[model samples]
Target: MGHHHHHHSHMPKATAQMEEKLRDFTRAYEPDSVLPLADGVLSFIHHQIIELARDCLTKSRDGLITTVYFYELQENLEKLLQDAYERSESLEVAFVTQLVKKLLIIISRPAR
Candidate 1:
């Protein structure tokens, strides 16, 4: 008979590292000379989102995990990224509240 084991774990260390990288990327802001402010800001936000998402997926366990949770997180993150990009394009201020709401939704979701 074969033996099997199942464990649910979250990688806090990797997550922290990813958060730090995001902070660094967002902090080191420089306007592109050629591109407009909107384009520049959008590019930066998008880059950070992509990096964070990739990090999460890479560090997490294989397909044994719940897809809904990961998918929701990805969706929320993408929404914030897109909102930032759109706001920048419109020369409007990016709202942290919206971002927070999305994050809250992700965090509140039940883990499977």
Candidate 2:
């Protein structure tokens, strides 16, 4: 894979909408004083959610991730994020919790 930004120009409309909403969510929740640094941290957390979800799905026996497994994933991710927040002091409890919930919903839903 080359460093081609436009390699996949066929992104679905809903994907774009999801990204838009995510950006708005970040703007709404991130503190105005630390917007610059929060931008990087939020994106890192956002990407982490997607990567962890993909790995969970990949390691599953079936194609489906059950509600139990989903909760397990949520707890694992929450702990990791919380620990990182405690040490690094970037993420807030409410912000991380809501972001995880919102993105998990987006990933769990089947695309049309």
Candidate 3:
């Protein structure tokens, strides 16, 4: 064997954080499958979450969507997960359901 090369690229900060968040919460639903399922589906689930956040915005007094609403975030996420299920494998769909439920609970108590 001559040599092998490796890249220094790493997951973005936000991406890793979201992955860990999903893994931590998914344990409640699928502890043994967390490793395999999360590794494959975290990216897909994360992208959907990003889209949900972007789509569900809070309007200001002037009627402009100036921020994302944590209060309604989970509601939007529940809907988003339905689309995720349509495009995902069965295991991935299950994980998405669990992650959405746990994440909703976590964000319900907004930090002020």
Candidate 4:
């Protein structure tokens, strides 16, 4: 008989503050300029990455996981941040950069 494995299920939810920040970030960048509906899609991805980072940080701080896991979380976050930056224009880079910095600060903090 062959062994089978089931994939685990999980959902990520962003804190209100993160959501607000993402909203403000999107508004400032106005992603819709480049792609129709881009603002909403980018905002959703940003929120998801932030939520995941929060979960990973909490788990790592609780000793439920290793630094390697947290590092992976940061890596994923960086990819989203980089994408946001790359999709933006030189004029909007500063705003996008600020958003990325804010996200980094949020993810780098010790869990409360």
lDDT of each: 0.45, 0.53, 0.48, 0.51
Model 3, 36-97: lDDT tens digits are: 44453555565554444333321222244334464456556756566666654566666566
Error of 4 at 43 (Å): 3.0
The candidate maximizing lDDT is 2
List where candidate 2 sits over 4 angstroms from the true fold: 1-48, 56-62, 91-99, 107-112
Candidate 3 structure lDDT: 0.48
lDDT of 2 at 20: 50
Candidates 2 and 3 compared by lDDT, better number? 2
Please identify model 4 stretches exceeding 4 Å from their true place: 1-40, 89-100, 106-112
Name the 10 consecutive residues with the lowest summed lDDT in model 1. Answer: 28-37
lDDT of 2 by residue, 38-101 (tens): 4565556655654564455454424465778767776777675674466465545455555566
Give the range where candidate 2 is weakest over 10 consecutive residues by summed lDDT.
29-38
On a 0 to 100 scale, what is the lDDT of residue 83 in model 2?
48
What does candidate 4's lDDT look like per residue over 9-50, in tens digits?
233434434444444444443323432324564655546544
Q: Which candidate wins on TM-score?
A: 4
Per-residue lDDT for 17 in model 4? 46
1 versus 4: better lDDT goes to = 4
Write model 1 residue lDDT over 7-87, tens digit each, in one string.
333444544444444444334433332223345555555444445434444444333336676676656666755566557
